Each structure stands twice: as C-alpha cells, then as structure tokens.
C-alpha cells in the first residue's frame, strides 16, 4: 500500500565490513485510516489515511467532522492509497511502520525543493555561450528558440526559463536499510525529495 | 467442385450433428466441433455426407470444397487419430516427456519446456525422437511446427529438429 | 528473397502465389529463386 512520513535529514550507517551507506531518516508515525473507499460507492478500492496532530482550533469544522466519522484524532493533512485487490482495511485502523519490515526496496515520493524562477542553464542543462571572444549581452541566454518562416512559431514543450522545483517527484526503488519499529523510523539508502520536515509518501517498489 | 462432388463416408460409432452451420463430430478418439462458413451448406444423405454450394453467394465451390476436405480429415481423426514423427539430429540434443510437457534440450543454456495444448498424446520411443499423437490435424501440425521452430534444420549437417518424411538440402563449405 | 518489380518463374519448380495482396514466387529446388512483389 504505502505510508506517509516526515523527512528527518540524512545520516550514514557503517556496515561492519566497511561500507558507509548513506541513509535518509524517515519518521513514519502511526498512520491511521480515516476512510475506506470501495467499488460500491466510489468505483475503485482505496484507503484514506492521516498522521501527526493538528491543534484543537486550526482544523476547521468540515475537516474535524470528517475525523469524527472515523473516530480518529485530527492528524495533519490527508492522503490516499490504492488497494491491491487482496488487502482490505477498516476505518479507524492504525497502520504502523512494520509493513516495510518484509520489503527490500521502496519508491519514495515527495515535494522537491523550490529553486524558484530558474534559467535555462540551471533548469534544462543548457550550455552557456562563449564567456568572451566578442560576446555581447548573451552569455547565459537560451539563444535560438525556433526556425524561421516555416513553423512561423515556437513549438510547444520548448525548453525555456521558468519555475524549477517545488513539484511532486518520485525516486524509485530505494533500498531499505533498517526499519526501527520502536522509534517509528524507516532508513532508506540514498536521498529522497524535499527538505527536512517535508512529507514523504513511501511505498513498496512498483519496479520489482 | 471435384472435391465437393465426392461424398464423405461416415463409419459406425461416429456421432455427427449439424447445429445449423455449427458441426459436431463425436467418436472414439475425441469429440470435435467445427463452426463452418455461412456460404457452405451441408446435409446428411444416406450413409455419406453431402456438401453443396449456396445459391446467391459468389464463391461456393471454393468454400464447400474446403468443408468436404476438413470433415474428411475430421472423420479420419476421430476414427484413427493422427500422428507425427519428429526427430532430433545432432550430438548433445535430447527429447524427454514428463506428463503433458516436452523437455527439449537443443544445446541451449536453458532446457526448453514445450507445453502441449488440447488432447495431444506425446511419446518418445528413443531419446532423440518425438512421436506425438492426437485427434486434430491442426493442433498436431502446429505443435510439430513449434517443436520444429525451436531449432530448424541446419543445411550443412542437417542438425536440429526435423520431420521424418521431410528431405533436407545440405551444402558444402566454401 | 528478392523484391524486384518484375518477379518471374525462373526454373521449373518455381510457383506463383498471391499472399495478402502481394504476388510472391516460391520455389522447392533453389531458395535463391524465392522472390516478392510485382
């Protein structure tokens, strides 16, 4: 299915043979189920979960009622996961990090870090034009953006300067290292999207 | 035309049934069903079978002359049961049957396990020869052709899977 | 096989067939005579 969990920096695990494997520390608290969507009502089978804890005020009535339907505490944010036919869950059930104990590799999805209005050099790996040798006011500019009369136009999906980052991205098949049940952690090899404190939708590897 | 005008004999213990155009021939070896073409018209006449071209349609004789030749093989199939004699030529090559799965070793890195769809009774008189039997000419012919298509004859030593009746043209080194 | 625009019956065992619209010439003796199109 998958679990939601906040990113908590990175560390390295020293394996006894030698290798210092770089790991991301994902805290994965008791992900508790708010709604069980199914084929009768919704036309698909899925579960909506929550985690963390909002203060008793910042949650609105429409959202707070939604939590009373299930009976769970008002966790911060809400996410959904599609069920894989065989598995079936109940409302108000608390899923833990133990689901990732059996699995080897995981797809971690998150929100990548916001770089802002990035140029074509940074955003699309464009080559900067000659820094000197005559050059005039066009070092880091894109250069040409089209042909001539023929298209009489720039084509759609042209690589240009714009908003870089702050987008949902998925790093696939990251190898799990340790599943700390007691501290509610999930140590995965490598680096995952977003800054410390950002939410990570972790799930088992679709590319098996 | 000429084939179409030559009634098919139906031996005893062979239940033929005409569900409109859908023909069902049952016998000792197996039950066979054939959804025949709409342009063909078929009936029972005395002991033998009769195949007539439908008036109105363009190509009758061509369609019925097929039906005749199909049902001729279909009647012989349920009566006798068709067989094919395949042989594996070349050193290191091996053929062995376990249940309904033929284990071909044809010098590959992995042993090939060929499945047998439908009622096809596979046998092995020797380790380098596959004799397989059944009701349908179609399925046997296909199975045989797959088992062949795993390793066609090398036209130098005649190596690979071959039909027993087939001749193979080999050539010299230049 | 060849794809020449004027396929012909080269030897005695060659044979003309029309498969999927395309005229092909198939042969028993020499596979060289096998050819397509035209």
């Amino acid at each position: 299915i998958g679990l939601v969990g906040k990113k908590v920096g990175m560390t390295r695990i020293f394996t006894e043979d030698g290798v210092s494997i770089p790991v991301t520390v994902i805290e994965v608290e008791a992900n508790r189920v708010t709604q069980v969507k199914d084929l009768a009502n919704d036309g698909y089978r899925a579960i909506q979960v929550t985690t963390g804890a909002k203060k008793a005020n910042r949650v609105t009535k429409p959202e707070a009622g939604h939590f009373a339907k299930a009976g769970v505490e008002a966790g911060r944010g809400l996410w959904e996961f599609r069920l894989a036919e065989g598995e079936e869950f109940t409302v108000g059930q608390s899923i833990s990090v133990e689901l990732f104990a059996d699995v080897k590799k995981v797809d971690v999805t998150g929100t990548s870090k916001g770089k802002g209005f990035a140029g074509t050099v940074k955003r699309w790996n464009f080559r900067t034009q000659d820094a000197t040798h005559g050059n005039s006011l066009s070092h880091r500019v894109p250069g040409s953006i089209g042909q001539n009369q023929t298209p009489g136009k720039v084509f759609k999906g042209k690589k240009m300067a714009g908003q870089m980052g702050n987008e949902r991205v998925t790093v696939q098949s990251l190898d799990v290292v340790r599943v700390d049940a007691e501290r509610n952690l999930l140590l995965v090899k490598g680096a995952v999207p977003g800054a410390t404190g950002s939410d990570l939708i972790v799930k088992p590897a679709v590319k098996a | 035309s000429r084939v179409a005008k030559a009634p098919v004999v139906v031996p005893a213990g062979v239940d033929v049934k005409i569900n409109g155009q859908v023909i069902t021939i049952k016998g000792k070896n197996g039950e066979l069903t054939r959804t025949l073409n709409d342009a063909v018209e078929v009936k029972h006449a005395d002991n033998t079978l009769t195949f007539g071209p439908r008036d109105g349609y363009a190509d009758g004789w061509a369609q019925a002359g097929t039906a005749r030749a199909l049902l001729n093989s279909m009647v012989i199939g349920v009566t006798e049961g068709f067989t094919k004699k395949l042989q594996l030529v070349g050193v290191g090559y091996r053929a062995a049957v376990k249940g309904n799965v033929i284990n071909l070793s044809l010098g590959f890195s992995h042993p090939v396990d060929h499945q047998l769809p439908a009622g096809i009774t596979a046998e092995c008189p020797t380790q380098t020869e596959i004799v397989l039997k059944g009701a349908d000419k179609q399925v046997i012919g296909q199975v045989a052709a797959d088992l062949r298509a795993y390793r066609r004859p090398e036209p130098y030593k005649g190596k690979g899977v071959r039909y027993a009746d087939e001749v193979v043209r080999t050539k010299e080194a230049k | 096989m060849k794809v020449r625009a004027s396929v012909k019956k080269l030897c005695r065992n060659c044979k003309i067939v029309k498969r999927d619209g395309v005229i092909r010439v198939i042969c028993s003796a020499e596979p060289k005579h096998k050819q397509r199109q035209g």
């Binding site: 084509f155 759609k156 999906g157 | - | -």
Partner: protein, 141 residues
C-alpha cells in the same frame, strides 16, 4: 408576409432511443445528424436548434463494411512539437466505443455554437442500459 421562424422558447424537443447493434456507421450517423439538427420537423429553422434528443445505445456493436474495421484510421494531433496520434477502428472500439459515433456524427453536423449545441443532444452509450429512463425516450429506427 414575413415567414415563420421557430422560437427557442416555444420549441418542444422530443426524446428518442436508437439501438445501434448491427448498423452501418455512416448511414446511422447521417440519420442521427439529420434528426439532431431538426431537419425532419416541418418547423425547421437553420438558426434555431429545433432537433430532438437521441440516445444511441449499443455503440460498441456498430458495424462497418469492407476492410474498415482494421483499415479505417482516426488521426489526431496532440497540439505538440511532433505529436500526431493515430488509432485504427478496432483499437478505437477497444478503448473508447462512444468516440466512434461521436466523431462520425460531429463531422456531419455544422461547425459553430449551434453545431456544438445540437451535438449535446446526442447521447451515445456502450452498454444496453441507459440512465435516461425518466424522459420516456421512445424507440426510433
């Protein structure tokens, strides 16, 4: 005398069902596009949407002559750098069977606000069941 012209308020639009099982696509689509426009009606006016609401159920089962089940291609551009997407008549019904009658009718109607307005009336369907039981849509052939 100034001739009569149908008044959008006074138009009394009727509902119909057409089972498209074993029908010729174009000759169905033509008769559909005839009614949708409001041609058959004696109070026809080209600038008012006089035509009737039609439900075309069993769209997936529509028939085509010749080799057009395979041969007939539906080209469309994606509005992109070099994105020309094609799809055969088999592959079209395989995915979206409602599109076949839709596209076959849309072309036969006029092009413009009223042309789009008179398409809205058409209600194609893959399954035999239709949820428009409330209007009492009578049988049409």
């Amino acid at each position: 005398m100034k001739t009569f012209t149908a008044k959008p308020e006074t138009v009394k639009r009727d509902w119909y069902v057409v089972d498209a099982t074993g029908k010729t696509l174009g000759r169905l689509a033509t008769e559909l596009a005839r009614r949708l426009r409001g041609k058959h009606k004696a109070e026809y006016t080209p600038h008012v949407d006089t035509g009737d609401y039609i439900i075309v159920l069993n769209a997936d089962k529509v028939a085509v002559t010749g080799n057009k089940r395979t041969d007939k291609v539906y080209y469309h551009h994606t509005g992109h750098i070099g994105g020309i997407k094609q799809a055969t008549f088999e592959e079209m019904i395989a995915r979206r069977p409602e599109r076949v009658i839709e596209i076959a009718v849309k072309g036969m109607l006029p092009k413009g606000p009223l042309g789009r307005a008179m398409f809205r009336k058409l209600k194609v369907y893959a399954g035999n069941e239709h949820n428009h039981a409330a209007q009492q849509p009578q049988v049409l052939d």
